[PDB]
């Protein structure tokens, strides 16, 4: 569950037996906010992905290069073992 | 709270925090409260345009030495001394916890000693430049972000009910179509396998038997007979065909028969089981050793402990010389 | 010093939606039975299993009551001979494993089977093997009884090269050619593995099929309710109506 | 129990923010129950005293048994990918520095899987399965009289194979039960997120996180049925289909591709005794990574360096399994295992301050 | 679950009042835990493609294995005695009047047991098997299909063996599952006492209860240790070790002694779906017995002359059963039925007043 301070109750009403998980995740929130929505039977509900589409795909593929040189490092290895096999075998079978 | 654990300890490696901050040592310090700067009307810095011109930020990215993965961070577990260096307020390092109270850091010249220990209350300490960094967030969404009011349909629109519900029961027509195929299909396993439907289904080539002769075909565990019937053993039948009724288990001949020719029968004694000898009996028929059954050449028994005639199997003429049982 | 790997042979059921050529297996029938039947056996294989699949219910009894079956017992406990019948397995040549190796220099010829999808390549391997049968390497000489295949562990097989161009006569009229036979028994012996992989792959095109039209569908119904969560506007000092 | 379904799943409330990647747990659970379905009815029709033959029987007689035999089989598969790439994800989150006990929980059905899996191979009773069980079984030879109890004979026979097949029926059963208390564990130590911190923005389960969770699964489905009728990835090694031949080894005796990390482990390291424990130090020495930790914070949403060194380690040493046992490959096989424990001291060692 | 344990045994009150025949409940789940266990390590040994000669290597070979042969097959008959005992306990003391549910739970666990306990009879593989299951199936003849697909060929054969082994290793798991709904339904809704009303005179059940239990489970055991070693009582008929010879009928198809109550009623109506129905009607009929009453009370602690008859009905059914198929019995045995319907509507009926 969340902090003491957070899942403390105002209400006096008890617990339902069917939303105990769900007051556990109560949080205390500090000055209030206006939450606004709308049904999704009365907006778009494929065009956020198009729309994000581009933007998702950028910052995916800067942050996967951070493993750019560790992979060409462990493809470096890779490439000299599969190499220094082949070298092993001939000279201790091929005549 | 539910069982935890704190690493509240005294390492033998790393110094306390009060020996050595890895944070940015420069706070400053008020009298109450209510006289530090408001974040919300502070100007923050000049915003930028390139993210090269950002400004520079004051944590050391070295704070932290030897083995192990890099980390970043300004705090620690570790238990303090019960002596702790005096921190330097006057340069503006932070005092709060054990050096403020295991400390004469907050005693002052000549104010009255409630005076001076308030002022170190941890309230009165706000990092330098606490009101021109903090974000100060007037929404979760900002400018130029999608959000409902560009998504929102026009209101000249159709109703966009019947194709979601066509779409969400679509996917429960074809999983219940996938649920039915794969009950379907288990309880189909169950059948008889492929080996055993073969199994119980022989053909009896009538090519080659003579009239009077009687062979045996093992057919699902059970003996049949097959007999080709000589006139002499047809007419037989025939004439206790009009004695019915004086019979343990009145039948006809016909009745038992499909052609006069061909006797089919399963070859058990109605009595326990007994296979019955042809040829054997004082009826010329099938005689079961075991108690005494004599039955007659249509299979009707006639004398003995035996109660019922033999049965006869399910079986048709695939032709005028071919049987298939089953 | 793994064998070497079989080549990709262009099979027609290797597509997605393509089944089993029966003409070839059926010539493929015909190389097992009067080639590689002499010293192999194929336990596991009925000759009901080729009925309305291979060749037509009349036709595989004839095949089964060409060989003869020791059945038993009879009446005075005696053993006896009876032509085959659709439930009967193919026959098998030796009556054990040691009868098998005595007759093949101590070599014992694997059951054919599962020998389709036994090792590694599959059926290329078996239409490898048949044609891997070159003259030795130089500098390699091998004991009388052992052949040079490329494809066979080792290199040495105690299998005599099997096919010879004009061994047996297709019904068909197809020509008999070494590579042509390859292919059939190939064929044949994939068949035999997996009698049911028409029907594995038919149901399976239709599964893999109707799982597309399904995906589309939890994909609107998830788009749909998410879309009341990801445009959501939270705000604290600000109002937009 | 409906009340208790009623707080678990339709007013279970979780972050928002969460990727796919979340949703790799769903489908373990949905996985795992029809490997327990098709294994019950695979026995109805399955022959004990020879596996060879039932497998046999089972693909050419039974109607759609084939459909079971595969399932069953590729569906194995499945169940250590899924598995395995949760326990990368764990890694790569580092969900185990507060939420511990979910992440012991998962490693007693991780432990339990392993033996579920390699007796369940052995059931198919070919060539690798007999040599296969023979190797590994020999490693406790130094125990006296311990393998004649385990084979019930002086070599491996269908006394083994009645004896492991009960292990076989059971302990996936028992596997179950500890879903529940990792379940338990998960609903009140609330779950991680993609952002270290707790934050308030969750929604219920049935109606938002059910529906991308079927998404998931949907996806993973229609990628496995064409695994399951075309086998477009090699996952099962044809050697199994061998018949067992006590005097001759096979070409190679190496167990399914989800064993491969833990087989190279044992043919490089000399001893043979050295290689099974430092295959225990595997799969033990995960279980302490933030033990010894000292500051305020969870390592996440760094660069993750040593993580992907981590997991190509895994991927390498799985290709080494398959190679055969050159000199050269042994060489390279011991330099991974010396750069994994560097990796591993990384993970374990706190910082001491400038 | 360890303050689930300690407030359903150590703080569990219960009347002080009770009689021994409140430990047979208790004696049931603990003869049937014991029923599982052997049952399991049985199977590390039994040959199932021929369960006849699977027993012989049991008794002979295995060490100790023809304790576990003779504990499962005596076991079997402790488990129906007190299981019997319990329900005759029941129908004594009226407890279903206001206990239904807790009378609908143990229903339930008796269907389930009535099928456990057939198949296994079966799985011995001998004369009295074969014909037994044989007779019981051609009950359904008259559902089209259903024999064939049930059987699994146009006889019995391994092939239905292996199907009922499965039934026969997972129904008792569930049986199991259904114990915690009785037990729950027990502590929630109160026990009866050997008196009609509700009383203040209960005490904990670990310290005194279990004591007693104890008491009454191990002076069962004494008499169940003589029976397992010395086979005191012929629990077992001989003709199951004969081999199966499907052309040949034994000299007699019966069933275990707990199935000779409705072997009987069916030997005995001469339509054989009638013989059915009336076996589907002893069972299903007492779960309403209380249904149609108006009255205050549970018509308990008075003469129970009713209830004596009907205790003596199924002994001299059971009794019938034995005998072979003579007329003379038959009549008699149709006029206990005729009877026993009686007893019954004595029970539904209400009373009008004078
Ligand atoms: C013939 C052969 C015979 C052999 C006989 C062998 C018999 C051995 C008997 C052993 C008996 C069991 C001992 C178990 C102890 C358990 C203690 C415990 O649990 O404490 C928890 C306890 C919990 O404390 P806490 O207060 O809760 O937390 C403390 C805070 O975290 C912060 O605390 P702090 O800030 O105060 O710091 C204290 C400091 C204190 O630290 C120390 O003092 C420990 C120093 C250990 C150094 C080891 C270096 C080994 C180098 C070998 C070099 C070989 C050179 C060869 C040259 C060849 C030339 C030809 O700790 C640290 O700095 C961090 C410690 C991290 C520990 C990590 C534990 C990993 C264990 C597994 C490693 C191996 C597995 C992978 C490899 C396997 C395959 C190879 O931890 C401590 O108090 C710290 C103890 C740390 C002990 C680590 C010991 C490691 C020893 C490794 C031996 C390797 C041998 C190699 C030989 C090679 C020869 C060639
Ligand atoms: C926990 C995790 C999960 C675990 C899961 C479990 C896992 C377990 C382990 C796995 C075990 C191994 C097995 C795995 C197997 C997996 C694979 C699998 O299952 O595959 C199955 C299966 C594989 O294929 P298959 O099973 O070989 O195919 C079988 C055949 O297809 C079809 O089957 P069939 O051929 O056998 O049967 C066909 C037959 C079946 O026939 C029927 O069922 C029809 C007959 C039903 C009759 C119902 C009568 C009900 C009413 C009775 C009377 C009530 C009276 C009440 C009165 C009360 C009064 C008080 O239907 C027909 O012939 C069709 C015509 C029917 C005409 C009916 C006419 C009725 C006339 C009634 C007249 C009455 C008048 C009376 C008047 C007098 C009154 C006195 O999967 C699929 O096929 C997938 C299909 C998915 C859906 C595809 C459709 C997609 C649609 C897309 C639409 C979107 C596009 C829109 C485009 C729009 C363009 C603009
Ligand atoms: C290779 C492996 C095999 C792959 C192929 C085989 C896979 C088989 C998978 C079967 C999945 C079955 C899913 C059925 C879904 C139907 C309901 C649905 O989602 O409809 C959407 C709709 C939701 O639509 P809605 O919420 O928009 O409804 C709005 C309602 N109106 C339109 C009236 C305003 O659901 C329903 O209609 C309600 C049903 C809820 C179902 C909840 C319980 C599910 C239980 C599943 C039964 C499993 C039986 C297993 C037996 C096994 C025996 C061997
Ligand atoms: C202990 O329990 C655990 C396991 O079981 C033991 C695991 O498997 C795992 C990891 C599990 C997985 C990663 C999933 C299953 C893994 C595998 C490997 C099964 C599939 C098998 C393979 C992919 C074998 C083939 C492997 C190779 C060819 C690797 C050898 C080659 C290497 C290392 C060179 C390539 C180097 C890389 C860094 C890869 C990426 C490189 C690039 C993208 C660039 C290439 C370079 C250029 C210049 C283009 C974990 C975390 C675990 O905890
Ligand atoms: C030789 O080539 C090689 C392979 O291929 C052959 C490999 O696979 C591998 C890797 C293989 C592995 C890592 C796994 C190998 C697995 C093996 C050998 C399994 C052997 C069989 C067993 C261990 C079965 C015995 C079963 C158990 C001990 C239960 C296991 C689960 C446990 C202990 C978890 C918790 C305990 C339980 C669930 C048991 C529950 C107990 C009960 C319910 C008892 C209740 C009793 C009462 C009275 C109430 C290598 C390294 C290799 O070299
Ligand atoms: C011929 O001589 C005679 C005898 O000796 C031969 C007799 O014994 C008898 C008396 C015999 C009896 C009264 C009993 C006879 C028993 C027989 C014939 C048993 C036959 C075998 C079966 C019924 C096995 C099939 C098993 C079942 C249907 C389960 C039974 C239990 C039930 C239905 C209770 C509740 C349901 C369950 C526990 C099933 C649970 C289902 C699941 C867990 C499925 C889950 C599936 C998913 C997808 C989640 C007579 C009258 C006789 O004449
Ligand atoms: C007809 C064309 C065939 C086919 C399709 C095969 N054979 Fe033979 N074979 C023989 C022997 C003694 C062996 C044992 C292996 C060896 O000799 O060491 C084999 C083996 C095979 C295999 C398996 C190869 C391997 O991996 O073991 C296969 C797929 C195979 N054969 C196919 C002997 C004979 C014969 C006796 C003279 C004849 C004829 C054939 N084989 C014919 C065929
Ligand atoms: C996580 C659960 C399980 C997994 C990982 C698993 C794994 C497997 C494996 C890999 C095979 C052999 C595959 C092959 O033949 O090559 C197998 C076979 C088998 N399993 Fe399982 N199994 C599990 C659960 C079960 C269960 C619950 C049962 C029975 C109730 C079962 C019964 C069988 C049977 C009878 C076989 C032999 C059939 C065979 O040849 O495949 N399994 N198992
Ligand atoms: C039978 C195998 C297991 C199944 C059924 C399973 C299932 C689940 C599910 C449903 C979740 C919650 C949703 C999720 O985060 O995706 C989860 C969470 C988790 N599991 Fe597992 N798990 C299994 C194996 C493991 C293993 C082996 C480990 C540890 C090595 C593990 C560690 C965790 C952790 C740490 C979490 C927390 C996730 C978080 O905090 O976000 N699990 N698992
Ligand atoms: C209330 C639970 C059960 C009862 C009433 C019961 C009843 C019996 C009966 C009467 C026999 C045959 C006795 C004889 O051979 O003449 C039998 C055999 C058998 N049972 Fe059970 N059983 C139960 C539970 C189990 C369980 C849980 C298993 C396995 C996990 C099991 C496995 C076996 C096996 C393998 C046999 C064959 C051995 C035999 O010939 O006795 N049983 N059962
Ligand atoms: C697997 C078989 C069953 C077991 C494990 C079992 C166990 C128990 C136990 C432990 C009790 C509580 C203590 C007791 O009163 O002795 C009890 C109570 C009871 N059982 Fe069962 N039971 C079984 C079968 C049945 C059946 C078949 C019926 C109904 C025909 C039944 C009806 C009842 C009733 C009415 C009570 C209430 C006792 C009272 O109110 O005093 N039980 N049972
Ligand atoms: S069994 Fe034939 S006379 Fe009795």
Redesign the interface.
């Known amino acids: 569950p969340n902090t003491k301070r957070d899942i403390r109750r105002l209400g006096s009403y008890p617990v339902p037996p069917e939303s105990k998980n769900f007051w556990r995740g109560r949080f205390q929130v500090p000055g209030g906010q206006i939450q606004q929505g709308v049904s999704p039977m009365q907006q778009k509900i494929f065009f956020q992905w198009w729309w994000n589409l581009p933007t998702r795909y950028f910052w995916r593929f800067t942050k996967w290069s951070d493993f750019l040189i560790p992979s060409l490092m462990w493809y470096t290895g890779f490439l000299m073992c599969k190499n220094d096999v082949e070298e092993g075998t001939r000279s201790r079978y091929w005549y | 709270?539910?069982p935890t654990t704190v690493?509240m300890?005294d390492?033998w490696?790393?110094?306390p925090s009060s020996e050595?901050p890895?944070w940015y040592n420069r706070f400053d310090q008020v009298d109450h409260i209510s006289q530090h700067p408001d974040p919300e009307k502070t100007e923050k810095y000049p915003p930028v345009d390139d993210t090269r011109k950002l400004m520079k930020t004051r944590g050391?990215p070295?704070?932290?030495?030897?083995?192990?993965?890099?980390?970043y961070?300004?705090?620690?577990?570790?238990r303090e001394p019960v002596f702790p260096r005096k921190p330097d307020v006057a340069k503006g390092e932070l005092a709060a916890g054990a050096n403020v109270t295991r400390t004469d850091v907050w005693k002052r010249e000549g104010e009255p000693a409630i005076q001076s220990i308030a002022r170190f209350n941890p309230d009165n300490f706000r990092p330098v430049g606490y009101a021109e960094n903090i974000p100060c967030?007037?929404?979760?969404?900002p400018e130029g972000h999608?959000?409902?009011?560009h998504?929102?349909?026009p209101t000249w629109?159709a109703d966009?009910?019947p194709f979601?519900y066509f779409?969400?029961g679509?996917?429960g027509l074809?999983?219940l179509?996938?649920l039915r195929g794969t009950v379907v299909?288990?309880?189909?396993?169950?059948?008889?396998?492929?080996?055993?439907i073969?199994?119980?289904v022989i053909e009896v080539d009538l090519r080659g038997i003579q009239p009077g002769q009687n062979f045996v075909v093992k057919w699902?565990?059970?003996?049949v007979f097959v007999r080709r019937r000589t006139q002499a053993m047809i007419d037989a039948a025939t004439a206790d065909d009009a004695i019915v009724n004086s019979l343990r288990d009145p039948e006809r001949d016909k009745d038992r028969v499909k052609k006069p020719e061909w006797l089919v029968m399963l070859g058990?004694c109605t009595h326990?089981?007994?296979?019955p000898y042809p040829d054997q009996g004082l009826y010329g028929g099938y005689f079961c050793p075991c108690h005494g059954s004599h039955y007659d050449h249509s299979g009707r028994i006639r004398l003995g402990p035996a109660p019922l005639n033999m049965e006869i199997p399910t079986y048709e003429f695939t032709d005028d010389d071919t049987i298939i049982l089953g | 010093k793994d064998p070497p790997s079989p080549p990709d042979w262009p099979f027609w059921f290797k597509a997605f939606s393509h089944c089993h050529d029966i003409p070839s297996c059926r010539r493929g029938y015909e190389v097992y039975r009067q080639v590689c039947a002499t010293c192999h056996a194929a336990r596991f294989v009925c000759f009901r299993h080729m009925v309305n699949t291979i060749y037509p219910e009349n036709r595989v009894k004839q095949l089964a009551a060409s060989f003869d079956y020791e059945d038993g017992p009879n009446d005075r406990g005696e053993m006896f001979t009876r032509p085959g019948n659709l439930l009967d397995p193919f026959p098998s040549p030796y009556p054990n494993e040691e009868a098998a190796r005595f007759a093949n220099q101590g070599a014992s010829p694997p059951d054919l089977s599962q020998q389709a999808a036994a090792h590694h390549g599959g059926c290329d391997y078996i239409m490898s093997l048949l044609t891997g049968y070159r003259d030795p390497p130089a500098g390699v000489s091998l004991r009388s009884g052992l052949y040079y295949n490329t494809y066979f562990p080792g290199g040495a097989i105690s299998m005599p090269p099997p096919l010879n161009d004009g061994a047996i006569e297709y019904e068909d009229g197809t020509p008999a050619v070494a590579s042509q036979m390859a292919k059939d028994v190939s064929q044949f012996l994939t068949w035999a593995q997996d009698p049911q992989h028409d029907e594995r792959k038919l149901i399976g095109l239709k599964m893999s099929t109707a799982a597309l039209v399904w995906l589309f569908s939890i994909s609107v119904w998830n788009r749909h309710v998410w879309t009341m969560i990801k445009t959501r506007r939270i705000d604290f000092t600000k109002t937009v109506y | 129990f409906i009340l208790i379904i009623k707080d678990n799943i339709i007013l279970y409330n979780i972050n928002d923010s969460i990727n796919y990647l979340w949703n790799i747990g769903y489908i373990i659970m949905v996985v795992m129950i029809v490997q327990v379905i098709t294994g019950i009815i695979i026995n109805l029709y399955m022959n004990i005293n020879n596996g060879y033959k039932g497998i046999i029987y089972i693909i050419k007689e039974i109607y759609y048994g084939y459909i079971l035999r595969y399932i069953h089989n590729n569906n194995s598969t499945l169940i250590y990918v899924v598995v395995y790439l949760h326990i990368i994800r764990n890694l790569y989150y580092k969900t185990y520095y507060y939420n511990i006990l979910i992440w012991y929980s998962g490693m007693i059905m991780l432990y339990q899987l392993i033996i579920i899996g390699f007796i369940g191979y052995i059931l198919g009773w070919g060539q690798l399965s007999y040599w296969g069980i023979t190797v590994i079984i020999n490693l406790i030879s130094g125990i006296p009289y311990l393998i004649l109890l385990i084979s019930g004979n002086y070599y491996i026979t269908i006394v083994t194979i009645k004896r492991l097949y009960i292990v076989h029926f059971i302990l996936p059963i028992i596997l179950i039960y500890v879903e529940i208390i990792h379940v338990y564990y998960i609903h009140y130590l609330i779950n991680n997120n993609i952002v270290e911190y707790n934050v308030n923005n969750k929604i219920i389960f049935n109606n938002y996180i059910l529906v991308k969770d079927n998404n998931g699964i949907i996806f993973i489905l229609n990628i496995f049925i064409l695994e399951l009728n075309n086998n477009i990835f090699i996952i099962a090694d044809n050697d199994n289909l061998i018949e067992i031949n006590i005097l001759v080894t096979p070409i190679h005796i190496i167990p399914e591709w989800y064993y491969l990390y833990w087989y190279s482990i044992l043919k490089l390291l000399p001893n043979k005794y050295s290689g099974l424990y430092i295959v225990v130090n595997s799969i033990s020495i995960i279980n302490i990574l933030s033990e010894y930790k000292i500051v305020i914070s969870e390592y996440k949403n760094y660069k993750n360096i040593i993580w992907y060194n981590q997991i190509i380690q895994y991927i390498s040493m799985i290709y080494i399994g398959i190679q055969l046992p050159i000199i050269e490959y042994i060489n390279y096989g011991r330099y991974i295992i010396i750069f994994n424990i560097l990796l591993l001291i990384m993970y374990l060692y706190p910082k001491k301050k400038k």
Request: glycine residues 10%; hydrophobic residues 35%.
């Open positions: 709270h539910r690493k300890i390492s490696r790393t110094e050595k890895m050391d070295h704070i932290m030495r030897g083995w192990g993965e890099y980390v961070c300004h705090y620690e577990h570790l967030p007037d929404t979760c969404v999608l959000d409902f009011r998504t929102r349909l629109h966009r009910r979601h779409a969400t679509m996917f074809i999983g179509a996938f299909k288990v309880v189909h396993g169950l059948w008889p396998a492929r080996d055993a073969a199994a119980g699902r565990g059970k003996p058990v326990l089981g007994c296979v």
